[PDB]
């Protein structure tokens, strides 16, 4: 999420905690700036490694004060940790105690590791507590910097994946543009909708990559980038679904362009955008009003209805084409049906695997590939889009589908 924090000290209970997966040899910097001191301060910090990812997931800030005691009485989850505490009589707002010239303090469940560093890439929990000895007085700035300026783990693979996807979509666009240019005398609206889909995918990937670059080099995410990416993704998915429905219905390929076919039937099927969008932005906001739990039910219902309709229509159209004795289009429709079947099977298998790999054990022992749940869908969509592109490639005899 973030790699730089600003915290005015006199707030709440003064605790500051964060849990996240971190690289190895990552340093944590604390800086204190503000008005002249009046009172003495006592700063205590804990940095704990986590063996398995459950602890980070179910870490509640409001109970941190209690959590610590469970850690101290030797009853918490397994994992080594470092603890330290220092006392300043008026203010050490200029000293560099946490910067350099430190000592080697032993770790607890010797070691003699660096004062404030990560000794192994894993899920870490950092807690800092400021006690003032007897309205703002200070403003603590906290940063984490590792081998990469601000890009923690769990984000590096995602950034690389988005870069690769951007390159792939650029290649898709270049190839489609070349084919279209070669044969411009005749074309079909489907070959324009495909290009629009490619363009939207390119824009989504570019936005995501730029946002990740900014987060890496500045430590803060851009406020209005996730929303834009989600909206673009929803638009692209809705357009692809509508295109598939139109192709299956045979509108303009096997039957005359009847008006009723679109009106009240297909275009209304664009409400799938709303729901698809509705959850999207909410997922960015964190599901604060917890409707995210009751958000995917309408989406699943709509997807089931659309699949049922698509398969019924495909069977009807293929039967009609076989009866008509046409041969050229029959092979194309057969390949289209096979591709759809394979996509459905892959989606089912992926859902089963994710469910059986995440909600199956007390706590995940393999958090490294925890990002795959947010990347398989995009790869599958890219594969489907490439197959469709190859099927409907403009050619010299691009008139068999009048
Ligand atoms: C309260 C305790 C129980 C709760 C389980 C909550 C798990 C969170 C993930 C939800 C999920 O399981 O994901 C959804 C898939 O449907 C399902 O629900 C799975 C089968 C069940 C059918 C209702 C949404 O994903 P989608 O929009 O279909 O993916 C397409 C996107 N292109
Ligand atoms: C092998 C290794 O990393 N050794 C490190 C060294 O790089 C670093 O300059 C020094 C500073 O405390 O601590 C030790
Ligand atoms: C800071 O608070 C701790 C409480 O854990 C207590 O030992 C003392 O007041 C301070 N610690 C020092 C001065 O080492
Ligand atoms: C703490 O000691 C004095 C006493 O008030 C204070 O003025 C100063 O800023 C702090 N540091 C030192 C070295 O005196």
Numbering used by the authors: 38 to 146, 168 to 192, 203 to 470
The study reports:
In this study, we identify and characterize the unique cation channel TMEM87A as a Golgi pH-regulating cation channel (GolpHCat), determine its atomic-level structure, delineate its ion conduction pathway, and ascertain its functions in Golgi homeostasis, protein glycosylation, and biological processes, and investigate its contribution to hippocampal spatial memory by employing multidisciplinary cutting-edge technologies, including Golgi-specific pH imaging, proteoliposome-single-channel recordings, cryo-EM structural analysis, molecular dynamic modeling, proteomics/glycomics approaches, and animal behavior tests. The structure of hTMEM87A contains two distinct domains: the globular domain [termed the extracellular/luminal domain (ELD), D38-K213] containing three glycans, N62, N79, and N127, and the transmembrane domain (TMD, Y224-P473) having seven transmembrane helices (7TM). Taken together, these structural analyses suggest that TMEM87A is a monomeric ion channel with a putative ion conduction pathway that can be opened by voltage stimulation and closed by PE. Taken together, these results suggest that TMEM87A might be a voltage- and pH-dependent, nonselective, and inwardly rectifying cation channel.
Although we investigated the ion conduction of TMEM87A, we could not identify an ion conduction pathway beyond the constriction site due to the presence of the R2-fatty acid chain of PE occupying the hydrophobic TMD cavity. Based on this, we hypothesized that the lower hydrophobic cavity of TMEM87A might be a potential pathway for ion conduction and that our structure represents a non-conducting state in which the lipid chain obstructs ion conduction. To verify this, we determined the cryo-EM structure of a hTMEM87A mutant A308M, which we predict would block the ion conduction pathway at the entrance of the lower hydrophobic cavity. Indeed, A308M effectively sealed the lower hydrophobic cavity, resulting in reduced channel activity compared to that of the WT. Interestingly, the PE density in hTMEM87A A308M was displaced to a position similar to that of the S6 state in MD simulation. This suggests that the lower hydrophobic cavity of TMEM87A is a potential ion conduction pathway, and that PE displacement in hTMEM87A by the external energy, such as high voltage and mechanical pressure steps, could affect channel opening.
